[PDB]
Design a protein around this ligand. Structure first.
Ligand SMILES: *[C@@H](C)[C@H]1/C(=C/c2[nH]c(/C=C3N=C(/C=C4\NC(=O)C(CC)=C4C)C(C)=C\3CCC(=O)O)c(CCC(=O)O)c2C)NC(=O)[C@@H]1C
Ligand SMILES: *[C@@H](C)[C@H]1/C(=C/c2[nH]c(/C=C3N=C(/C=C4\NC(=O)C(CC)=C4C)C(C)=C\3CCC(=O)O)c(CCC(=O)O)c2C)NC(=O)[C@@H]1C
Lengths: 183, 183
């Protein structure tokens, strides 16, 4: 009978509960908006895992440049002078990725991605109590889950402070979204 | 300048993160769908707190009958024979709320709400580790967060098993949504 129609909404209802409740769906929609908003050729979420590993877990590329999605690496060491900047919740404006001495090893990554300038925006976690790893601060009582990055690839773009300011605002909004959705 | 327009999306982006991430927004949208789907005059989420208190925290009434929203009570004791049924994850079909001996005290509540029949659907929580209260089972390793109820008010409605079956499916979907969103 039309008991058929009862489930045509139950599958909807479940579909939304699962949709909204999974982290990637809202990661994937924020980045698709950061991209269309800042008119930037690529938006990635570089995720850092405390064992050392790290991976671009979401990405929104203009079709012109490579899918750095899933791009990854193990035992990721960042320059101390840079994590300080990042634990303080401060974005990082890299107006010339090419001569950026802190990213002087992501030359492979830089040239395939074809990145000219970029803004890097920490995603932080107030993780109190007990957890220790590679991306964690005791001075700041905060953990660095990953990084929202935005890639100027077509031109060496110059960034206004409000651009970084803004990306950081959005990053700091993900931070809250992610702390909830980790099971 | 048009730096104005940068924030007209940031307020959107934040608006969605906050929207999706707060429990009530998805409680309120499920019930508005359970209601429009089962053609039932009222849909409530009766929430049970372990101190004893309990309250109708969301509701979707047809404009014809009272807002039992926020309707509440303290030191709520349910008949043991009934929690067993509920911890097992089994909905309860009450085809005549009026002569339901287990709800023989919600006569005030029944007559204002004007409830003729109803389906009652437990919302359960696999709460392991350490927490004990009034709504918690050791036999079933499960806690009873609240109850999704559906109220036939216009007529003493008869319910097909699939109707209860279905409401329970939806209840069991909330259970997963709520376990995530408690901070
Ligand atoms: C070189 C000095 C070291 C380093 C720099 C560094 N990397 C990031 C962020 C990223 N790291 C990667 C991935 C890689 N790390 C690697 O060491 C390698 C192999 C060479 C790879 C492929 C990626 C993809 C990023 C994100 C880059 C992006 O802009 O999307 C940073 C932080 C961000 C910044 O630009 O400030 C830094 C400083 N990381 C190391 O592990 C090296 C010892
Ligand atoms: C009487 C035997 C006892 C009781 C029955 C009972 N209540 C519910 C669920 C609800 N309880 C309330 C609120 C009240 N509980 C009260 O004791 C009072 C005062 C009389 C109120 C106002 C509400 C609103 C509900 C939800 C009812 C609904 O259908 O929306 C149940 C569970 C659900 C069912 O119908 O099986 C039961 C068995 N609760 C008690 O605390 C009494 C000792």
């Amino acid at each position: 009978m039309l008991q058929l129609q009862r489930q045509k909404i139950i599958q909807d209802i479940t579909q939304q509960i699962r949709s909204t409740l999974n982290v990637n769906h809202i990661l994937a929609t924020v980045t698709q908006q950061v991209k269309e908003l800042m008119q930037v050729e690529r938006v990635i979420i570089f995720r850092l895992f405390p064992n050392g590993r790290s991976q671009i877990v979401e990405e929104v590329v203009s079709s012109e440049y490579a899918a750095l999605k899933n791009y990854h690496w193990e035992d990721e060491k960042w320059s101390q002078e840079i994590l300080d900047c990042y634990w303080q919740g401060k974005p990082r404006i890299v107006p010339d990725v090419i001569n950026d001495i802190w990213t002087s090893c992501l030359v492979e990554y830089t040239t395939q991605g074809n990145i000219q300038s970029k803004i890097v925006a920490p995603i932080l976690q107030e993780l109190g109590e007990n957890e220790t790893g590679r991306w964690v601060s005791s001075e700041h009582k905060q953990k660095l889950w990953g990084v929202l990055v935005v890639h100027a690839c077509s031109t060496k773009r110059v960034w206004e402070e409000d651009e970084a300011q803004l990306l950081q605002q959005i990053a700091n909004q993900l931070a809250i979204a992610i702390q909830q959705l980790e099971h």
